[PDB]
């Protein structure tokens, strides 16, 4: 627990996870017995980040208990989770700041247009300027409230990214039911720690714009919640992905998506696999390798 | 890892979504609209502000060409209030879709059980192999091309007819490609599935 806590703190130290108004909960659940007390927002966030790893280990152990096929959980999962959390936090904060700045520019231009129509009222066009102003000011007021909402969105970003970052890193092999169970457990633990997060989060919607979903559906993506989440996992991956697709739809989806990049098909069983892999690594074209059940170890580095 | 594997819950969700789309499309709209109160609608609402600001400073005293620029400002007046109504009506809609979706849930569980039984049929005879496209085609026939639903408008009767036709069409389609010995076995499996799904 201490190693996970320390490797989390020094990777999420560059992030602005500071909240001066963080009300510490009366009774907090702790994985790191030596947490600073009373914990601050950064301390609580890192403790929750370790809760994600601990709960995932417990879930895998439970799946082993009921005879299900388990998958190894290693420190690299935690490093990938923290990297995804950092990239997602930076991306969402950058997007919100860009939107808020654009809305401030819009308010400036609305005030400029109000000045222009006031100049035009100095001059039967003049009477109806009373209507356009009645519209413009209303729009201005609307934009003002929109700006206020953005502030609340800031207060909700951090935990939300956590609940998404873990989802991108850990719960990729699990089925939909256990994915939802893990997400509910993480959300409950975040609620227990007074970390502010959206109540009704949609993972597939928080991590992808509708243009991307439309593009995926244009490709051979079966449109389901699990399939959309998987398609997101094929976009926000730090480590290369392993696609378990008995149907075979996902291979066609990857092929159609990366056709512009001239992706080429290969399999481990193929005799000319190593040379094709050498060419792909040497020149940079993307590659899809099939039949990884007979995984060659040469791909380890 | 990225698992594109069909399971009980995945097929249950797919079937429930299909039923809500086919038989209660209003709830499907109110569900797709509940996941569009996230980035989609607000992104469009401010993407319209982008075009507004593009055509707001294009002025040299010609803003009042007819004093009818408000139309461009009215196109954003409507949607905002609309996306302010749905944000206000986001708890009534959520409870409503929950209540309406739980009604159509036993059908989804029956669908998952039936498909997984068809997948289980392999170890009874080597010929008894059926793809998920087979079950989904059975469901498309049961929901859209069902002559028994014509003229029925009450939703409860439609649901009951859909369930009965699902069991019947599944048995007919599967048993047309089975030896006569195993028809009773599959019928017994479907009867057990309905007994799990039957009420009372």
């Amino acid at each position: 627990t201490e190693a996970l806590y320390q490797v989390g703190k020094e990777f999420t130290s560059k992030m602005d996870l500071e909240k001066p108004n963080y009300i510490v909960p009366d009774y907090m659940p702790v994985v790191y017995d030596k947490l600073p007390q009373p914990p601050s927002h950064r301390e609580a966030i890192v403790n929750s980040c370790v809760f994600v790893h601990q709960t995932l280990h417990q879930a895998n152990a439970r799946l082993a208990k009921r005879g299900g096929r388990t998958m190894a959980i290693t420190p690299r999962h935690y490093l990938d989770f923290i990297n995804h959390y950092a990239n997602l936090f930076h991306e969402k904060r950058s997007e919100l700041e860009e939107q808020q700045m654009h809305l401030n520019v819009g308010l400036r231009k609305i005030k400029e247009t109000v000045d222009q129509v006031e100049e035009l009222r100095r001059d039967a066009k003049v009477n109806r300027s009373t209507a356009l102003l009645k519209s413009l000011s209303a729009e201005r007021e609307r934009w003002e409230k929109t700006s206020e909402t953005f502030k609340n969105q800031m207060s909700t970003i951090a935990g939300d990214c956590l609940l998404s970052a873990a989802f991108i890193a850990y719960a990729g092999y699990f089925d939909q039911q256990m994915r939802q169970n893990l997400f509910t457990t993480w959300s409950h633990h975040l609620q227990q720690a007074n970390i502010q997060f959206r109540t009704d989060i949609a993972r597939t919607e928080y991590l992808s714009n509708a243009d991307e979903r439309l593009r995926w559906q244009a490709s051979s993506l079966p449109a389901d919640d699990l399939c959309t989440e998987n398609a997101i996992m094929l976009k926000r991956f730090n480590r290369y992905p392993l696609i378990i697709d008995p149907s075979g739809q996902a291979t066609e989806f990857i092929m159609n998506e990366y056709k512009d990049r001239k992706i080429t098909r290969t399999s481990f069983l193929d005799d000319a696999f190593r040379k094709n892999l050498e060419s792909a690594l040497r020149f940079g074209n993307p590659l899809l390798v099939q039949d990884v059940e007979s995984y060659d170890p040469v791909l380890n580095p | 890892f990225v698992n594109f594997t069909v399971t009980r819950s995945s097929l249950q969700s797919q079937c429930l979504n299909e039923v809500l789309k086919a038989e209660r499309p209003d709830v499907d709209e109110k569900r797709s609209d509940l996941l569009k109160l996230q980035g989609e609608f607000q992104l469009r609402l401010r993407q319209l502000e982008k075009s507004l600001l593009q055509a707001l400073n294009e002025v040299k005293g010609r803003i009042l060409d007819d004093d009818t620029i408000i139309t461009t400002l009215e196109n954003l007046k409507r949607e905002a209030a609309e996306v302010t109504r749905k944000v206000e009506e986001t708890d009534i809609v959520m409870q409503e879709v929950e209540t309406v979706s739980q009604q159509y849930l036993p059908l989804s569980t029956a669908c998952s059980s039936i498909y997984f039984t068809m997948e289980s049929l392999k170890q009874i005879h080597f010929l008894y192999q059926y793809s998920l496209q087979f079950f989904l085609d059975i469901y498309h026939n049961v929901l859209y091309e069902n002559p028994n639903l014509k003229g029925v408008t009450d939703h409860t009767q439609r649901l009951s007819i859909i369930t009965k036709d699902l069991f019947q069409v599944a048995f007919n389609r599967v048993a047309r490609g089975m030896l006569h010995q195993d028809h009773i076995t599959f019928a017994m499996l479907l009867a057990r599935i309905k007994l799990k799904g039957t009420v009372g």
Binding site: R66, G67 | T117, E119, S120, Q123
Partner: peptide, 29 residues
């Protein structure tokens, strides 16, 4: 139980226990 995957090991434990109890422990040569 290939279609049903919910408890299968809970019953299989009792079944295997009974099968062990039934068979004699050894057969003298």
């Amino acid at each position: 139980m290939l279609e049903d995957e919910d408890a299968w090991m809970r019953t299989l434990h009792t079944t295997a226990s009974n099968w062990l109890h039934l068979i004699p422990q050894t057969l003298s040569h």
